[PDB]
């Protein structure tokens, strides 16, 4: 029997660190595709 409260298991990531890291990744990816280009991420689009 489940005792106490019922909630949804969750994850947290610190926003400033995450955004800065994604900025660094963008900076380093722009070298392999030319300086002036646009990069946009998007969540997974299917599968198991």
């Amino acid at each position: 029997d489940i005792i106490g409260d019922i909630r949804q298991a969750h994850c947290n990531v610190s926003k400033a660190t995450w955004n800065e890291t994604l900025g660094k990744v963008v900076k380093q990816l722009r070298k392999h595709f030319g300086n002036n280009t646009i990069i946009r991420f998007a969540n997974s689009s299917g599968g198991d």
């Epitope: 299917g46 599968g47 198991d48």
Partner: nanobody, 126 residues
């Protein structure tokens, strides 16, 4: 050998879903990504994405995102573990995509460029 067949073409009224099946055997099905290539009459080939049957990975084009589902079915029993079926469900199609669809694949260990091709299911819209 390398056995691959298609099924489920025809003509459909606008606003319905077209199911296209590609059934493959003769090789281990875990590897060898399926590549779904559409050929529109009067023009050279165009590519609409690919699928990976290890975990149903998909990778679409810059046009079909939100209109296509590249599903799969593996073999449940270990009796014939190399009998795979890749399904493509296309939805909400405009009148301007009467074409022929092929389920190509690639060499042993890679995916580019396509060697084997399919007889091709032809789909028309009325």
């Amino acid at each position: 050998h390398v056995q691959l067949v298609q099924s489920g073409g025809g003509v459909k009224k606008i606003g319905a879903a077209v199911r296209i099946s590609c059934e493959v055997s003769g090789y281990n099905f875990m590897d060898q990504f399926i590549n779904w290539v559409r050929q529109a009459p009067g023009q050279g080939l165009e590519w609409m994405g690919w699928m990976n049957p290890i975990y149903g990975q998909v990778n679409y084009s810059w046009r079909f995102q939100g209109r296509v589902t590249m599903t799969r079915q593996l073999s449940q029993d270990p009796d014939d573990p190399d009998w795979g079926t890749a399904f493509m469900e296309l939805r909400g199609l405009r009148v301007d995509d009467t074409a022929v669809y092929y389920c190509a694949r690639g060499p042993s260990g890679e995916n580019y460029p396509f060697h084997y091709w399919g007889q091709g299911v032809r789909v028309v819209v009325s």
